[PDB]
């Protein structure tokens, strides 16, 4: 396409500003990826081992780095436009550098988008398995290799205002107090142990972390199944004491929200990068005819491909 000098300058300025936006997009996506990684730092235990969600932040970091690199290359292109004599030394390398940047950015961003659109689906079953594993490992606070289970579960509950995967009730059905701290001399404890199969100690209670600060009354953590166990509690849904929603639910919603935001960021960054690379390639092919001299008004033709498409097919 015949490109006159004034539109050439205007397009160079537009490419400069577009590359600035691309660098900003790379920065923000890198920040979001780091945020997701640090969030996953204290959440991996709750993810099923077979899950591969944590790989998405890893891929997104590389995608953002490549996007920022392309933005910096666009800034360099703007500088070369400012100083024509500064381009020639950056002529031979520019072609292969642009080609490699296009390939890498496209691959990384496409991989990131695919991961953002595929991995979140598995999060449901991933959390389903992981939270159950953590709860089953809650009791053994003394056994090595799982000591962090209790602390991590309690921190999760307190931070994200949740109780169990979904709800709290049948928490009574999972033992959450290490048998080491049970008094063998309690007739009721012995009777419960004998009655329940497998010897597990099941009690109508919940750990402190399950409480809700909003509760007007002090939190209740025992005999929750009985209506008369306390002056005012009843089976009717109480706003007080424990939380309403469940961990699995809250975590799934939050992680899906983060994944959707990251995917939207990836899509916008991909569009911006595609536009920036298209503009830079047009600028390069246009100035190739000019020989790197901006002042030249020879009206060079700017075409995306070096030659005809059929030529590329034949060269294959």
């Amino acid at each position, epitope marked *: 396409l015949v490109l006159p000098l004034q539109p050439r300058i205007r397009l160079a300025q537009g490419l400069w500003l577009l590359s600035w936006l691309l660098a900003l997009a790379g920065g923000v996506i890198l920040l979001c990826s780091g945020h997701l990684l640090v969030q996953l730092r204290h959440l991996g235990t709750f993810l099923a081992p077979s899950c591969q969600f944590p790989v998405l932040p890893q891929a997104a970091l590389a995608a953002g780095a490549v996007a920022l690199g392309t933005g910096l290359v666009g800034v360099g292109a703007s500088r070369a436009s400012l100083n024509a004599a500064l381009y020639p030394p950056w002529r031979g390398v520019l072609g292969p550098l642009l080609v490699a940047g296009t390939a890498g950015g496209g691959g990384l961003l496409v991989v990131g988008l695919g991961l953002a659109l595929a991995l979140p689906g598995s999060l449901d079953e991933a959390l389903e398995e992981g*939270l*159950v594993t953590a709860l089953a490992h809650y009791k053994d606070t003394e056994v090595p290799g799982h000591c962090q289970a209790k602390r991590l579960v309690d921190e999760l509950q307190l931070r994200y205002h949740c109780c*169990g*995967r*979904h*709800g*709290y*009730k*049948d*928490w*009574f*059905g*999972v033992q959450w107090v290490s048998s080491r701290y049970l008094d063998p001399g309690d007739r009721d404890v012995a009777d419960r142990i004998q009655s329940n199969v497998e010897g597990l100690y*099941l009690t*109508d209670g919940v750990p402190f972390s399950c409480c809700n600060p909003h509760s007007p009354r002090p939190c209740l953590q025992n005999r929750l*199944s009985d209506s008369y166990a306390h002056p005012l509690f009843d*089976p*009717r*849904q109480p706003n007080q004491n424990l939380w309403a929603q*469940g961990c*699995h639910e809250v975590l799934l919603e939050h992680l899906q929200d983060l994944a959707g935001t990251l995917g939207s960021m990836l899509a916008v960054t991909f569009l911006l990068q595609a536009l920036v690379l298209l503009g830079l390639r047009y600028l390069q092919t246009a100035l190739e005819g000019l020989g790197g001299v901006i002042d030249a008004g020879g009206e060079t033709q700017g075409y995306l491909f070096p030659s005809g498409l059929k030529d590329m097919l034949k060269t294959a």
Partner: nanobody
Amino acid sequence: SQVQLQESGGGLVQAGGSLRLSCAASTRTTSRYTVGWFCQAPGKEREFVAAVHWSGGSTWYADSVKGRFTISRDNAKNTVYLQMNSLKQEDTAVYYCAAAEPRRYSYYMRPDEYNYWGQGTQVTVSS
């Protein structure tokens, strides 16, 4: 006010026969209630038989009766149906339908959890 659960369908049957039991609530929120059934006979304590939860695609029964029983829900009528199939004399017992507020991660249930309990119905199987 306080919810009331009513059970019906209990009656005499012969060995190997089938039966239908219907438990009905009174509130309009039944779609979210998690429901279960228990059977108890003299000389034995309350035991789990069948469960249904929010999703409606989840059904769980005691291993001793796996498959032999069926449990379903009808939100339109706010009813819980249980079909007895291939009954045996030992199944003779009083059944209680129980409804509870959402407890949606222990797909298995025990009497310690449920809140609303119906009176129940006695079913006897004769050879």
